[PDB]
Amino acid sequence: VQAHLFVSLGTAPAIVPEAFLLPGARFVSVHVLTTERPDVTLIREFFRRHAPGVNLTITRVAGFQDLKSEEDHFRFEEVMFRWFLASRTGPEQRFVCLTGGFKTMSAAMQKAATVLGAAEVFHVLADDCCVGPQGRLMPPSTLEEILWARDQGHLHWIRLGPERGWPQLRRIAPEQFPLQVVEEKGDERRVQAEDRAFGTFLQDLLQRASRIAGAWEMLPELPFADLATWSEGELAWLREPLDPRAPADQRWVAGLPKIELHCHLGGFATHGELLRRVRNAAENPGKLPPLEEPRLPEGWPLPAQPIPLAEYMKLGNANGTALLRDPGCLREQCRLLYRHLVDQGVCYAEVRCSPANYAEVRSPWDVLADIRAAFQECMEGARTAPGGLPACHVNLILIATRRASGDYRAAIARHLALAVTAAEHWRDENACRVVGVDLAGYEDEKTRAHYFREEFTAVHRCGLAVTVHAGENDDAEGIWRAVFDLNARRLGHALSLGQSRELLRSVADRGIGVELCPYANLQIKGFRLDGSAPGPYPLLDYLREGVRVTVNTDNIGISAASLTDNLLLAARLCPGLTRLDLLHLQRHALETAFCTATQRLTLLRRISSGIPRP
Amino acid sequence: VQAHLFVSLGTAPAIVPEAFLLPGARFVSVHVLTTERPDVTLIREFFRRHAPGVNLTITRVAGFQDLKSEEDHFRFEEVMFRWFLASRTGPEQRFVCLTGGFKTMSAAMQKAATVLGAAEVFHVLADDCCVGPQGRLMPPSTLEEILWARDQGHLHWIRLGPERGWPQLRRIAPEQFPLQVVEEKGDERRVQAEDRAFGTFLQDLLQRASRIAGAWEMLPELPFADLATWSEGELAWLREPLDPRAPADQRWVAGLPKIELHCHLGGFATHGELLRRVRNAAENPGKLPPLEEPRLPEGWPLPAQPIPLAEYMKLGNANGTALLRDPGCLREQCRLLYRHLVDQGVCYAEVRCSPANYAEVRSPWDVLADIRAAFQECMEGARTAPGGLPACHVNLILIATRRASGDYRAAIARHLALAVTAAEHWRDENACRVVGVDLAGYEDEKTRAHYFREEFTAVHRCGLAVTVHAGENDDAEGIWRAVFDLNARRLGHALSLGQSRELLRSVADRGIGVELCPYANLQIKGFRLDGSPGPYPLLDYLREGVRVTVNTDNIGISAASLTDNLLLAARLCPGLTRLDLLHLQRHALETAFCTATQRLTLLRRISSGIPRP
């Protein structure tokens, strides 16, 4: 109910104290400007009296004596707009006055109230109030006739209708439209304006709504609907090549809301302090394995030579099946992963795990229950304020197991049966829930999974999604079979699709998604970096054809990189990538998720109103 | 370009003479509203002081001497408001100026300018203008110091800009909002009012718009990005129920760009003049069957009782197989269909046809070639100016045949072979081309054919989409089998999906489109109209996230177009808003069978064509 007051002052200073008087409407603050000519001494005396606690921010122009030239008009409008900007208050809290002014045209304030939302407009009136010595309604000597008129009420205040403001400018910040203070003498200040950028922005917003000449190419092909309210200069910044080494471009990617779809729980904390923290919350300290940390190759984030997959897997042999057989370690790892995900700014994640691996005495169901309980407790604990919803939704995807010595059919059957029952058990739509399964594996699984299509027909009826990790070999026939027989909806990696036009066109048309991990691909398969045997990274081509490409993290601990670093490295690998392409990537990732329609709408609202302005 | 102008009021007369001075702006009319006091003698001086000629209706209130009371503001607001109403001039012809008067009526009149709408707001300001005694900047004697100032350029008119006004209040008449003329003293005029109903209307409209516009979720979730630059009133209008009988919404629906996905070539011109036009272009007039138009049921567009499907089919027995076995008739039908589609405003269509039906002596390939050649000739003919592209794009879908007399498996094989060969033959991406097949009649029904899955693995590799028609019964098993074995991407009709949550959820998630035809569905299955067979399952599908479309099916048999189908869909499901139409268009665009470049071009064309109210 903080009613910050915005009153203009003319050559008559009675309007300030009088419009201060209002039915109720206790004012936390009062903001006024004038020109250099009028004095402030009697306003000083007035404010020293019964209202000393409130502040009186009286700002002044750099130079002004009258408003008769047009230049005076644009300058006054600009300075007044930057006033209202610098006030830093909610639209429902701003109040507008009689706007008398020293013939300040009295209309700029109404224009501001119309374009920028406010709460109310009132009009002071003088009726037999403060009858002066001359007989006319002169303002009091200092304040005595104010009290006199308040005693016998005829003056009053004529109140107009409230305004809401234009939808586009209703949300805005003073940082992109600042002002320079010439000098501040106590509560009084003198400021000045630089350029009519705000007027240019308003004129652009008016003009693009009429013609379609220049906006016709730009607006219709924009990823999010909230990007149509940006200025012409900002939209030009968005259509320029992204520099991954600029100290300013790095802080923009760090504030974007992000969606994550390829993460592994068993490869998070494998080195450094986090390993110590995980190895501290163990329930049974007596059976923890000896602390050995594998040695990373030279310049590990950017190795000079590709390493094979087996060495990559063994690089994380300090936190996995060895450590996650103790419940405390499992819970602590879940909590740390959630905290890191929240810090990165992710708003929706899908963690992949295989409960069978971390089970030697307990059953897989107990491991799944513990994981779900930990994640749900964290989600309920966080509960930030997008409307009461948790800060980061987390779902679950069940990948197959590793110890494939027992009967393969038995392992597959157990893996799918655990998923179906878990899907049936947790049916609430605001909590962790198993959403899909993974069919990673070929050769033996190629001979088993693809042939036994009838095995994977129950899952389809139970409401679960299927993702296939097309890793090594990456032949075309496997992709054809995965797309058309297994009815998968997302593909893993699959970096070679441009060697068969029919497959690329089919994948583009049907809508299947593709998941790419820059750091892992560079460190495992090898790729050229910067401007200068594998070919170019197939990200720009996929984005141009119309495929739904995403960028993910894969293994956070083994690769030692986060989502932001992955995006910047993706910018490095393909020269020419623009920021609009990053927003396209986010939109595609949102589209290809496994959530429900209500969650999709909520995520769209959250993302579209979070993009930081340049 | 007639300029009906509103000047101002003023205690000092000078406001009117200095406001009539505008650079390069001729006004055919001048209207003034003011109080009892002002010296009407000086406006009488101005009456012929200017010279050339303009109306000078001076309106007066029944009683007023000062703006000092709270009710005074409301009284003058209503009076001047109804003065605007009774003006009877176009929104783009009004001219508005608040140079003079007191403060409150200036604020009220600028508020009228923004809310009601205007074309330009200007301020007259004097700089060293008309110097008088003691060096006082003060109005001229009669007009001569104005002449001196014009000789010296001492006048500065400050122009602000145009206005838009709220959509509902843009069009209004004074008959329902009259006034009370006290006395029109020739050019002078006196008025009074009766109530403040129009101000109550404005308050109710604004408060209802505010209440409807809650959290600003509207901006993040608009269908098309171009709508994000609209004014608040237009969005509020878009968030209201659609009235299908008003003479204003119908033109808006007519103006909308549209996409058609369910049309039949063999049921276009089956009655009236079009039948005669088609029959007059036959190559061999001696072999034409005698003209016999079937008789339509009672009130055919909206029958009072459903009819069986067989009678619906027999209705179109004048332009079926009988007439189309002649090249001239085929060409004329194709050309007429293209012209009608262009007139309706369609920008992308997919016409279904069965070439085998119209082949007796000629082979099916000749029929297909003739159809493609006719459509391509028309397409290259139109090419108006989208970006240099044709005004309408037409692709083809091959449905199965009707004559299940011979070996049906042979018919299916020939159908698919023709489809594949035609798909490979024409490969340019800016011309008519076979884009998909329709495994209609459930292939040949599960009675004799079920689903030869291993047969339909070649069309997928050759790049053809599959559409499955849901006809009678519509058991969930059939839809399950179609979706997860035939890899279909669109479903026909399928009005019963709400009876199984799992099917609805799966269909919504995967992204399979649904095609609905309101007129045909009403005439064949029976439905309740104007809220009086269950309710029409269109609003439920939209609220559940399914991708729904509205089509025409048969144009000649049903005797309706896309616009009429949209309006009837509005009638069937009460509460449908004007945003749902754009949602349907977006879904139709997303479910089409075109290519990525065509999809981007279609998005650009649709998003830049939506008409503002």
**Which string of DSSP letters, residue by residue, matches A468-479?**
EEE-SS--HHHH
Helix, strand, coil percentages, rounded to 5, for chain B: 45, 15, 45
User: Sign of dihedral through CA atoms A280, A282, A284, A290?
Assistant: negative
Tally of CA atoms within 13 A in the half-sphere of A556 that contains its CB: 24
The residues, any chain, with a CB within 8 Å of residue B406's CB and separated by 6 or more, are none
A120 in a labelled binding site: no
Judge: A98–B98 Cβ closer than 8 Å, yes or no: no
In B, minimum Cα distance to A543 occurs at B596
Residue A503 tokens read as 């497959």
Contact criterion met (CB below 8 Å) for A446 and A473: no
State how far the alpha carbon of A357 is from the alpha carbons of A36, A320, A367, A494, B17, in Å. 78, 9, 10, 26, 92
Q: How far is Cα of residue A249 from the mean position of the Cα atoms in its chain?
A: 16
Judge: B463–A505 Cβ closer than 8 Å, yes or no: yes
B401 in a labelled binding site: yes
The angle at the Cα of B553, spanning B551 to B558, to the nearest 5 degrees, equals 115
Q: Taking Cα atoms as reference points, which of B247, B165, B174 lies closest to residue B202?
A: B165
Residue A381 tokens read as 């604990």
Amino acid at residue number A377: E
Q: How many CB pairs lie under 8 A apart between chains A and B? A: 140
Q: Taking Cα atoms as reference points, which of B358, B410, B603 lies closest to residue A546?
A: B603
Beta bridge partners of A409: none
Cβ contacts of A111 on chain B, cutoff 8 Å: 160
Shortest Cα–Cα distance, A435 to chain B (Å): 12
Shortest Cα–Cα distance, B481 to chain A (Å): 11
A69 in a labelled binding site: no
State how far the alpha carbon of A303 is from the alpha carbons of A227, A414, A565, A598, B65, in Å. 38, 39, 15, 43, 89
A5 exposed, middle or buried (CB, 10 Å; 0-12, 13-18, 19+)? buried
Query: Quick check: helix, strand or coil at residue A349?
Result: strand
Judge: A487–B489 Cβ closer than 8 Å, yes or no: no
Residue B328 tokens read as 């001239």
As a residue count, chain B comes to: 613
Distance (Å, whole) CA B262 – CA B549? 10
Cβ contacts of B110 on chain A, cutoff 8 Å: 107, 110
Distance (Å, whole) CA A69 – CA B115? 29
The residues, any chain, with a CB within 8 Å of residue B372's CB and separated by 6 or more, are B396, B426, B432
Contact criterion met (CB below 8 Å) for A575 and A592: no
Direct distance between the N- and C-terminal alpha carbons of chain A, in angstroms, rounded to an integer: 32
State how far the alpha carbon of B493 is from the alpha carbons of A384, B348, B354, in Å. 44, 20, 20
Q: How far is Cα of residue B153 from the mean position of the Cα atoms in its chain?
A: 50
Judge: A228–B224 Cβ closer than 8 Å, yes or no: no
Shortest Cα–Cα distance, B219 to chain A (Å): 7
Amino acid at residue number B373: A
Gyration radius from chain A CA atoms: 32
Residue A155 tokens read as 């003056």
Alpha-helix residue ranges (DSSP H) falling in A540-592: 540-545, 556-559, 563-573, 579-591
Cβ contacts of A506 on chain B, cutoff 8 Å: 460, 463
Beta bridge partners of B470: B493
Q: Taking Cα atoms as reference points, which of A469, A464, A376 lies closest to residue A417?
A: A464
Amino acid at residue number B357: N
Query: Quick check: helix, strand or coil at residue B97?
Result: strand
Contact criterion met (CB below 8 Å) for A333 and A550: no
Beta bridge partners of B467: B438, B490
The residues, any chain, with a CB within 8 Å of residue B55's CB and separated by 6 or more, are B28, B29, B30, B31, B187
Contact criterion met (CB below 8 Å) for A219 and B225: yes
Strands A120-124 vs A157-159: parallel, antiparallel or unpaired: antiparallel
What is the residue whose two structure tokens read 């209307």? B201
Residue B15 tokens read as 């406001």
What is the residue whose two structure tokens read 């950028």? A197
State how far the alpha carbon of B518 is from the alpha carbons of A95, B238, B524, B549, B564, in Å. 52, 23, 10, 10, 9
Contact criterion met (CB below 8 Å) for B84 and B112: yes
Gyration radius from chain B CA atoms: 33
Q: Taking Cα atoms as reference points, which of B73, B101, B104, B77 lies closest to residue A123?
A: B104
Task: Go through A361-373 and write b for each residue having 16 or more CB atoms within 10 A of its CB, e for each that does not.
Answer: eeebeebbbbbbe
Contact criterion met (CB below 8 Å) for A238 and A578: yes
B403 in a labelled binding site: yes
Q: Which of A107, A205, A206 is facing B110, going by the closest CB pair?
A: A107
Give all strands of the β-sheet with A120-124 in edge-to-edge order: A157-159, A120-124, A95-96, A5-6, A29-34, A55-60, A188-192, A180-185
CB < 8 Å & 24+ apart, contacts of B519-522: B519/B301, B519/B552, B519/B553, B519/B558, B519/B560, B519/B564, B519/B565, B519/B568, B520/B312, B520/B553, B520/B554, B520/B558, B521/B493, B521/B495, B522/B302, B522/B568, B522/B572
Contact criterion met (CB below 8 Å) for B548 and B514: yes
Resolution in A: 3.3
Shortest Cα–Cα distance, B526 to chain A (Å): 31
Distance (Å, whole) CA A606 – CA A256? 11
Beta bridge partners of A493: A470
Query: Quick check: helix, strand or coil at residue B515?
Result: strand
Distance (Å, whole) CA B8 – CA B30? 10
Distance (Å, whole) CA B460 – CA B458? 5
Q: Taking Cα atoms as reference points, which of A30, A23, A32, A37 lies closest to residue A2?
A: A30
Distance (Å, whole) CA A478 – CA A501? 16
User: Sign of dihedral through CA atoms B589, B593, B595, B596?
Assistant: positive
A333 exposed, middle or buried (CB, 10 Å; 0-12, 13-18, 19+)? buried
Distance (Å, whole) CA A178 – CA A378? 40
Cβ contacts of A158 on chain B, cutoff 8 Å: 70, 73, 104
User: Sign of dihedral through CA atoms A310, A312, A313, A318?
Assistant: positive
The angle at the Cα of A227, spanning A223 to A233, to the nearest 5 degrees, equals 120
For residue A394, the surrounding DSSP H or E stretch is strand A393-398
Q: Which of B161, B213, B460 is facing A484, going by the closest CB pair?
A: B460
Amino acid at residue number A567: L
Contact criterion met (CB below 8 Å) for B535 and B498: no
Judge: B68–A546 Cβ closer than 8 Å, yes or no: no
Contact criterion met (CB below 8 Å) for B492 and B469: yes
